[PDB]
Design a protein around this ligand. Sequence first.
Ligand SMILES: CO[C@H]1O[C@H](CO)[C@@H](O)[C@H](O)[C@@H]1O
Ligand SMILES: CO[C@H]1O[C@H](CO)[C@@H](O)[C@H](O)[C@@H]1O
Ligand SMILES: CO[C@H]1O[C@H](CO)[C@@H](O)[C@H](O)[C@@H]1O
Ligand SMILES: CO[C@H]1O[C@H](CO)[C@@H](O)[C@H](O)[C@@H]1O
Ligand SMILES: CO[C@H]1O[C@H](CO)[C@@H](O)[C@H](O)[C@@H]1O
Ligand SMILES: CO[C@H]1O[C@H](CO)[C@@H](O)[C@H](O)[C@@H]1O
Lengths: 438, 438
Amino acid sequence: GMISVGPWGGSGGDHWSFKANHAITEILIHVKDNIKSISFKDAGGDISGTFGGKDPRENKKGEEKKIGIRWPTEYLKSISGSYGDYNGILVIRSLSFITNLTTYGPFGSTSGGESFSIPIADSVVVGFHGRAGYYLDALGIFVQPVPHRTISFGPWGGPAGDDAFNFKVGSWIKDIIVYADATINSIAFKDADGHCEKFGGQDPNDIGVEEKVEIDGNLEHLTSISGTYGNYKGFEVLTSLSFITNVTKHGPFGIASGTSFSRPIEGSLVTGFHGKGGYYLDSIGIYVKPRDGSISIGPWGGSGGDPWSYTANEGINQIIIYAGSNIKSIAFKDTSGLDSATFGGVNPKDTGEKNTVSIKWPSEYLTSIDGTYGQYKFKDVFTTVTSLSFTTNLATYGPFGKASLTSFSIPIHNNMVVGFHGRAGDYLDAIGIFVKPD
Amino acid sequence: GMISVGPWGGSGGDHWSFKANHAITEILIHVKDNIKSISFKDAGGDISGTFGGKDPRENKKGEEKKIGIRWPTEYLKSISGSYGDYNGILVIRSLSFITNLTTYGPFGSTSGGESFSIPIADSVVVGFHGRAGYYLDALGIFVQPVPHRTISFGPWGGPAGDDAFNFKVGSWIKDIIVYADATINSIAFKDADGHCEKFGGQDPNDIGVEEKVEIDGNLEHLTSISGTYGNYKGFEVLTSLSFITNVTKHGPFGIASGTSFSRPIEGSLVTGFHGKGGYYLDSIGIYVKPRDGSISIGPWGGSGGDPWSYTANEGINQIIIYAGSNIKSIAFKDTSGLDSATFGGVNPKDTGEKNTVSIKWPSEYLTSIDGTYGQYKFKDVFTTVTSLSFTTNLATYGPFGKASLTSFSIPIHNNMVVGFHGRAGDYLDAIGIFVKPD
Ligand SMILES: CO[C@H]1O[C@H](CO)[C@@H](O)[C@H](O)[C@@H]1O
Ligand SMILES: CO[C@H]1O[C@H](CO)[C@@H](O)[C@H](O)[C@@H]1O
Ligand SMILES: CO[C@H]1O[C@H](CO)[C@@H](O)[C@H](O)[C@@H]1O
Ligand SMILES: CO[C@H]1O[C@H](CO)[C@@H](O)[C@H](O)[C@@H]1O
Ligand SMILES: CO[C@H]1O[C@H](CO)[C@@H](O)[C@H](O)[C@@H]1O
Ligand SMILES: CO[C@H]1O[C@H](CO)[C@@H](O)[C@H](O)[C@@H]1O
């Protein structure tokens, strides 16, 4: 799917939204003291309508400018501009067009209003939305990641923090653990699977107070964040935060001081975080995916273990499986480097042997899994997956482990596997798949 | 999905295409001796761009007309108009807007060009496409069926034929059997499943010559038809036909005489036919679905029987199952009356007892099936489905038949069943499902 950003400007005129089928290669504007109208052309040569330009007065036509994007080598990544009063109406006064190579603009008046910019990385502008009548009341963008990347916002805060962090998750962000009083002392995260995370919080003299947010991820999801950054005991840091969902706002935690950051985004899901800490939380950014469903099959195996799941962002490239007389652990690698956790293998005295499956994406993609489950006894008796195999549109890989009496398979066709789920602890208790058509 | 119709007009200007998110409620045009520009508004209040209107000369602005569609009671169903030369260019000269209540127009010059109209029923205009620069070079429409209906084109030919026919299929049109020499004598059709069909061909003195078209329906599909109608031995009938695919044109069969009909359509699949015959083929029309994939699961059962499949057009409402100590036959009813054939039950001495499942669509929809298969002996020993049950998001229905040793089920979630497939002869040899997410 795509993430919406903005729109910036007024609430007059009529709403419009133009998603280009191919890359945006041309923007035409008419502009004088403000932007009278805008239209787009795409790589295959389709034009959008002309949005705005409806003032009947000849003076008020403005001048035509054409911005050409030199596809396929140049691609639009972002915009900047300004909005303000024009003869009484809150309107887009100027625009810039931000490419991977350069900036076209600014076009229109940069005086008499308020500017905007976007703290975004790794995006491609795939469309626009906004408002118009006589003029361009409002404008915002639609974005997708550049190939094999994930759109980034931020980071906000200071340039300090000796312990940097990045990660992304294949499922959702489920628990957030924050310490704070005067500022944000530290931040940690618990992936739906129970895999945890941590940051900041290294001042023995300023520890703050713990708060816990559980995101109830079937109905609720983390869509964005807001907060504040400012000078704290000399350091430029993040001083408050709030975790924003479709259901509610969790927080704010901390103390709002310095400068507020918000992000006008819609259609987003926060899959990850990046930034730096130390004594406190110097900086933080987010990774977002489009709130783009899978069918779910299984899981097969025992009742033990913590639930886990993994959905590839792009397409699953690799599977790492540890086996002995049962399956010990399993992990996934996708084409865009979004590794999954290792599910299982928590006991260092029983981790078995490594096996690997390679899948030649895109011409090869996973079709299903097969296997057995049964009882395995180590220090205690468990019912877990004991053997596993995988099928692609081209081949079968595996088997791995030791077959037991109870077997499972799926006579499925015209699909692709887009992720896995199950339960795991010391071992892979249970496993199933997520599939989509085609 | 949606079916494209047209565009009509010239090949100058730039291409554009606007699919409205909600119903089209307004069309604005600028027009003088031709249509200078066009734009649309939708029920939620989004506007499209203004397509055309780029002539810099003030004379050449044209006059604004607004056509309001009185949603939700009035909906646009079609258009008509004309194209012809305007100062040197092949261009839309006039337009009409065809609603379920009335016609708005005509707007522009009806002289000096060529008109078009659309032999269409049961459609809703959901968008437009076309071409523009200074003016409206070209215009075509996007259509979807009105709810619970199927878009119809035609019929073409005469008003005579005492034996009318209609049908639609849930899978594809696989074999076409035509008799013809001077005209089309008769036409018959063989559904992918092997279910046959027939028409015309009742003149003992004029039988024509048989021709057979098999549509190789995995890669090839029937997208449209063309042909000719004219006076034949006094009767106005269809005198030639061709069956048009994405791979090739099959035919023309017969003799081209009278008037040629074609249909400018894209994105279509012919799911059905309607019209009338007698001695010969008086008339014929088509039903088309948007060339909108399902995942396929199973089938479970024996190797015997002819393959069959069924995909609901809307959502499956009812299941009729005949059972004894095995399953005899199964058939489906969907919400839009697209019944499926009966699969199985060909032997009148072994048809067992009727059972029925009702599903309360949309809040109830099928989730999966369960059952057994085994050996059944009547006049000969068969391996067929012997028992069946169905699950919805709400309940389980069945079981029906007599359970045997070998059982089958699918631990599947977050899906819906959108059709069935398998094999059948005298009985239901084998059965599986087609599923989609959500
Ligand atoms: C001329 O007035 C119209 O156009 C402007 C934008 O051009 C809107 O702000 C306003 O609400 C009207 O729709
Ligand atoms: C106390 O110093 C540490 O912590 C602060 C933030 O608390 C960072 O700016 C600094 O680089 C060190 O990592
Ligand atoms: C060692 O115990 C853990 O691991 C097994 C599977 O290995 C699970 O059944 C159990 O619930 C715990 O999570
Ligand atoms: C003025 O010329 C332009 O516009 C017309 C339609 O307005 C096109 O036919 C032509 O090819 C150019 O694109
Ligand atoms: C011979 O008459 C029959 O056949 C012709 C077409 O062949 C029909 O027009 C007519 O109504 C009868 O059904
Ligand atoms: C009576 O024979 C037919 O029916 C059975 C199932 O009923 C099939 O196995 C067989 O191939 C024929 O189609």
